[PDB]
Amino acid sequence: IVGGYTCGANTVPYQVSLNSGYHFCGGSLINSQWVVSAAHCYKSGIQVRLGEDNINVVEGNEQFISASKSIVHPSYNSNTLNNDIMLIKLKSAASLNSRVASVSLPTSCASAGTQCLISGWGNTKSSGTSYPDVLKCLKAPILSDSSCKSAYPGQITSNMFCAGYLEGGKDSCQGDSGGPVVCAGKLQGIVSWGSGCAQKNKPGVYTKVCNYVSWIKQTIASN
């Protein structure tokens, strides 16, 4: 997260870290058994870590749970970056408490201007890297489709939306992928892609969760 702030330990109870010997992507807990992340974050043998703040060391509130099923949206196109969403089923239910909680799904798309909370352990600096030990937070607004498309001509499908600042300076970055974009208390997006980080006229592009809800609810009910 570039240009954000330290969230605070367990202040984003639904934020998860997908681990494969090391943190490689974020995710969002939607219920005791399922996690939503990015499709481009697919890996076999994923270990889901809940209740994390400092991802480098154990602090007492983490829950490490192996993934039993990793379902990449059938229409995922790694070329065009379209349909960048993946569902993960924990092979063991998570103990829901004050530090580990699910985030509800949006049953209606959010409108431009709505302020969102984006989080992750990705790069925090520009033209250079610096990965944080603890979770970073960032407040950013959903942008309009016309603006999104003018910033990324020919690249924006209906399953994506831009959030952030045309001015640049604040945005998600490498390492935040698969992470949550929560607005008005619902998971409206998934940290997907972007050109650079916090660059001018190049805001973060996120998977538009609202289009995949019916599918998510269906998959959860039959797997």
């Binding site: 010997g21 790694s78 070329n79 960048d84 990705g122 490498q174 992928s177």
Partner: protein, 175 residues
Amino acid sequence: DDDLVDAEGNLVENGGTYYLLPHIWAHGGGIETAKTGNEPCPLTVVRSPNEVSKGEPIRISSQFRSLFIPRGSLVALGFANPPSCAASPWWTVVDSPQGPAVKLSQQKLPEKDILVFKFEKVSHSNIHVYKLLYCQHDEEDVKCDQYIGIHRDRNGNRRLVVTEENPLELVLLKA
């Protein structure tokens, strides 16, 4: 455990700098720029004549916000230290007297003009070696049905170009 790995078993960082060398200690060395034909400045991407030079550190970037480079992901390749005359350090493929050739541009390029590459791992020798593919945006589904190769011209410049049976094998080494 994913795809892109450097010459140390270590994973390749999205947006990191690497030296793109050859699989065979023959042909040439690392990648760099050169002024070929009638160019006003170093706009041609070539493989160093020196089969021992690590060439220029190259940034390898994916649009995805992941710290690694996703599987089957298109990537853009650009020089960490461009020639100055280039509006961008990112490579692109343009029609030249020698067919589509890898070159830098004096004009600022859009995402879709630079994200036209993709790596292909070679399990042979198991050593981390990849073939470089060239993808062109057809319609709602790009086609990565071409590779990048070499074209030794008149003066001996090993130019990177689009070929069919002259693919290039490379080993990425952190810089």
